[PDB]
Amino acid sequence: SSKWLEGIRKWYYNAAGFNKLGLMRDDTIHENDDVKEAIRRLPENLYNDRVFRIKRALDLSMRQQILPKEQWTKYEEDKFYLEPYLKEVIRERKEREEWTK
Amino acid sequence: HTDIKVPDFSDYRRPEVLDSTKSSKESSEARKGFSYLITATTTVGVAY
Amino acid sequence: RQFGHLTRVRHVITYSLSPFEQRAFPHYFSKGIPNVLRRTRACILRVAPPFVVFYLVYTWGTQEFEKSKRKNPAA
Amino acid sequence: INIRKTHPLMKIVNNAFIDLPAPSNISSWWNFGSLLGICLILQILTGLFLAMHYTPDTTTAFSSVTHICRDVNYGWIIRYMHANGASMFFICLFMHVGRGLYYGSYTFLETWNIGVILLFATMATAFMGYVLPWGQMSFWGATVITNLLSAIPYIGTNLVEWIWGGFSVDKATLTRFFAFHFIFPFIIAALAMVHLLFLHETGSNNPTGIPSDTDKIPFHPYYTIKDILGAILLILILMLLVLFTPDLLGDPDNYTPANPLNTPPHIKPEWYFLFAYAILRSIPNKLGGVLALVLSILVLVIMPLLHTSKQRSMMFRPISQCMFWILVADLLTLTWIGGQPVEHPYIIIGQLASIMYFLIILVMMPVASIIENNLLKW
Amino acid sequence: INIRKTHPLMKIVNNAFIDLPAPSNISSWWNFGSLLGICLILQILTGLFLAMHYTPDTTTAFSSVTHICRDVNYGWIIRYMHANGASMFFICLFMHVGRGLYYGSYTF
Amino acid sequence: PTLTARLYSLLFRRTSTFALTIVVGALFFERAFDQGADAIYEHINEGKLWKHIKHKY
Amino acid sequence: DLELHPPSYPWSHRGLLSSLDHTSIRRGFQVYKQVCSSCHSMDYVAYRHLVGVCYTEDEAKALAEEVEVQDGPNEDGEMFMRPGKLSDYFPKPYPNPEAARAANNGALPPDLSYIVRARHGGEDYVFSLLTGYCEPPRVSLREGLYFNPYFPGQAIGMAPPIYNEVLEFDDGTPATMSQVAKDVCTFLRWAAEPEHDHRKRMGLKMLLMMGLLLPLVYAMKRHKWSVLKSRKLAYRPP
Amino acid sequence: LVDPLTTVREQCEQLEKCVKARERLELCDERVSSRSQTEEDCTEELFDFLHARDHCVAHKLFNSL
Amino acid sequence: AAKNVVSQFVSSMSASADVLAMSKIEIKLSDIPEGKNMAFKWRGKPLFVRHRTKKEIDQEAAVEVSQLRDPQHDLERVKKPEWVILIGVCTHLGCVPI
Amino acid sequence: AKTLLHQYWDIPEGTECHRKTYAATSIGGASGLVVSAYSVALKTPTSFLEGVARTGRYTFTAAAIGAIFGLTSCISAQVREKPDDPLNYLIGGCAGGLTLGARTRSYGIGAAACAYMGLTAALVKMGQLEGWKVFAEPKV
Ligand code: HEC
Ligand code: HEM
Ligand code: HEM
Ligand code: HEM
């Protein structure tokens, strides 16, 4: 059940890879206009932290240099901060479609 | 902005510049000559 | 998309050194070979196990081809 | 200020090959664009010299190519370079397609359509030039694949006897094939520049899939020297296959004059059609077979609508990555199977290979992207 | 808004063929540019059909041209279009140059 | 290092002198590479050529 | 049928920088001259291509002024022969494939241009088929077929020519069986590839130029890319 | 004017699994001999030991030339 | 005008006059060994004249009707029972069978 | 059991491949069942789902050893073409030991397992080849 689902999720989060490049959930999202709108609706300091994480990750994949043990981003200390933003983007796009049709 | 220090590159350099007291003059032209002699030898191969 | 209207970035400092003063190949036998060993160990569990399946298929195909070629009655 | 920023052609060269922003963590899998460009222009120049020694006649063609190999200084190196350059051309082409499907670069719809158009065009050019030297394999493969084109009813049958110039292969068919093998690569180069134009509109794609808008570096002199090095490794492998092993990719059934009566039991084309031809004859249906082949490359067209992850790479979808490598092994299986005769286990695993091919593409990849979309609290 | 102003190809077609500001002055002497272009692609087409029916062997080149003009269907109209379309091609070339000189457009 | 420094100070300060120098080096190394390639290829066979046996006929 | 694979033999040109034995090519041309030039054709080799491989200028002029060619027109125009200096091909022993096929019990011999390169197996195949004749274990051999296993179907319409009338190597080589077979197979290797020595010479020059040039280009690429390998980022907010 | 082929083909395979398959060939030969118009022509054994004996010909011939 | 130009160009790409000029042939039958096919070129294609044995007349009698996926009787296909004469090309993809 | 080890030693070694790998995975399933049975019998896993996880871990490791060992056995025997040497199984035992160490995610366990599993697999083939009697005479 749920006590084993967390084990599967932590195995997948170890084997995903972006925990080793110092990244998080909201660092790998593929974009349309909607996700870039969600990026646009962010606070300033969170957006600064996101662009610095992105630029470090691109540098360390430029010389192909995985971070040491000290800064592998642990599972369940990461923020799912884009969940309200992206969720309201979902609701607004579905509101547009289902109201105009 | 006063505490902006450069993280060191002592692991990366050449030993001719790696010293912290030497004048960087004689270590300069030999270094440039080494890299430009590399480029010239490549140009010899490409021209052939 | 030309160069200069890309994004808005604060809070970043980039340091870099001249290409002349740092050497050509910094520790190319003391970092690169453990680095490519880590690269290889991070990929062959996701790349290698299909190709041994193909090698088994190749051996099986040639073997069964020759066995269906050879007949052996007795009279 | 500078003529490099004011002159109208130099606007194009400056905003194309100098002042282009680039993703900065490029691996050794983006040199293949420049390698395909250099393979293309080297094919054009070597074909141009070959056309400066060729006589398209159904009796003197093979003798004339022999005349090129013997009585011309270095004409053997130019003939061998055109053939092995076609080989390296398709090698670098499948590398380019494999990258452009792997790293999620197929989220660029317009470039993808223009690319698949180029894929058809390069296959057509290579097929017609493969017909041209009037060898035995050329003659019989021409007969087989043109009747495969004659599979389509009521519009295609007399269309194929029409492109034959009769009911056979003749001088008209030879000169049609020489005209099209000449004039297709220039349309290919124009579409290559259109491909390039749309990509320069959208920007490239880093191997992480993150939009790299804070990490752009200029094209010169970084990717210039990296592509020159990649081109020099390419020239090394091309001179390897034209100075040490011509026989590693040649065909023994090509070096005889097309005596139209023998039909040697060796019938396979060269490798870059062998995976396609294996999908053909693992189905006992002629029109169904050619429709299945065209629909396989149309599956390569209708890739992007299948994409239903939320991250665009395949560095970060490991089970999807494994299924991709199974797809690669299955393509190589198709290649080797098409490179064989036909008996019982060959037919069995050929049917296996085609149906598992469509099963991995059309089914396994969106199901994998959905399950590891669902397993990230998304 | 529109495809024509947001698509990278129709930007070029819009800036070459549609939103090109033309001077409202030019007479029929300026028609020879588009006529040279159409003659050029027509020469490409007729020559390409000639190339589908031609054998460049010098002993059989004359006979090959003969078989084009006789037994290939409409080979005579394709060959005659190619030759005299080259002739009208140079006529429109000379009117193009004479335009570009006499009307002083050679300041460029 | 001094031999690199003096070679830089003589030939690699200019650019036309650089191009003329690599032209001279290219022709020189062209001829020397021809000599060395002839010698090494004739050394790797030594008994199978056409030249020395055709003037030993 | 039962498929047979010829084993690889240590030929002189098997090595990756190896030449041919030009002396063996001279006597192999002599072997082709004596006995094999009755049925097989090798029309794409002129006598002038022998000048730097197996003969001199003058000896080739004698060899090519042996045979008449039947030159074309003259004052009468129809029929007259010609000695010919060098620009004659090998003069086509069977003038038509119909006349070739009726000369034997069918099964005309193919031409010998590309036999070594175009038979799914190199000179090992040709040597094995030429030397390996043996007796049938209960097959048919319908009146014109001989048994020699290195051949698809094992049925050959060629009389075994290898030791019948050994042909007196004029350089002074004792005509055994395998030595004359090795000679004519090396000569057919040469006739298939008239560029092999020169292509391995250019392979030598290319390998040395790529031992030279490639570390230079790689070094310069690493030099200009050494800035981005060692650039280092740091994060200043307030 | 005596060939070396005879010498090496006699000397190489002298007592060997080649000769084992030669006796196997004699066994299928007398199997054919005790049968009217057989299918199994006893040729399969001929090919595979001559394949083996010509491998050992391939290893040890070219010194004699 | 456009459909006339398209029509005349496709008919220009059709064939030659003498390529459409086929011919009638006469073949001699009994030059052929037993159980064996001989091919004579005609209308571009090979032309099969095969001596089928009386054993092969019996093997044609040993052919099931509907198990032929193109189910046809032998007398529906041949005229004389012991000599067979057909088009020398397999009609699937232009191969010539052995 | 006797049946599956007899299946494993039935096939010539030799090239009759991947039956060897499946028989070695059956060896792995049996070994994992033994170890998992004693381990859940002598732990009180608390609770049963974690016991299922432990059993799955042991059976997966033993089956992976069997699979990798059978693959490298067959491949090495096909490449070296000498079906009588024990050195191919020496390489096989070292490969199985390294993969055991990697699934246990260590270095020293992998290297010592390489050494001991290689030498014992060499002893297995060496005794099966020269002929050492299985578990008894029992005669005198
Ligand atoms: C006329 C008789 C000769 C002579 C003097 C030689 N050959 Fe042979 N040969 C001849 C025929 C009619 C055929 C065809 C038979 C068949 O189709 O089975 C052949 C065949 C060959 C081959 C064929 C192998 C293949 O087709 O793959 C070869 C390589 C060959 N002949 C070589 C050869 C050599 C080297 C000869 C000189 C010693 C030679 N033949 C003599 C007819 C004749
Ligand atoms: C005619 C042969 C082709 C040529 C000459 C060609 C040329 C190029 C070039 C020069 C680039 C830019 C360099 C690079 O990104 O590595 C490129 C990128 C690309 N091409 Fe092609 N291409 C060809 C075929 C294709 C095909 C068949 C496709 C698939 C539809 C394709 C899809 C792409 C994509 C998606 C990119 C962007 C890759 C990225 O930015 O990561 N190309 N091509
Ligand atoms: C427009 C430029 C080209 C010209 C003029 C040209 C001309 C020729 C000619 C005359 C031949 C016959 C020579 C021979 O094969 O011995 C030939 C063969 C061939 N061409 Fe091209 N070609 C061109 C471009 C290409 C391209 C772009 C490709 C694809 C990469 C290609 C693929 C081939 C192949 C595969 C052969 C057969 C090679 C062989 O078997 O030797 N050609 N071409
Ligand atoms: C690229 C497309 C073209 C091809 C493939 C092509 C091909 C040919 C061929 C095969 C011929 C010989 C047939 C003949 O002489 O009647 C020919 C003749 C000729 N072509 Fe072209 N051509 C092309 C474009 C042009 C162009 C643009 C011109 C210049 C306007 C031109 C001028 C001529 C002329 C003057 C002749 C001589 C006609 C004659 O003497 O019979 N061609 N062309």
Ligand code: FES
């Ligand atoms: S069956 Fe496909 S062509 Fe004869």
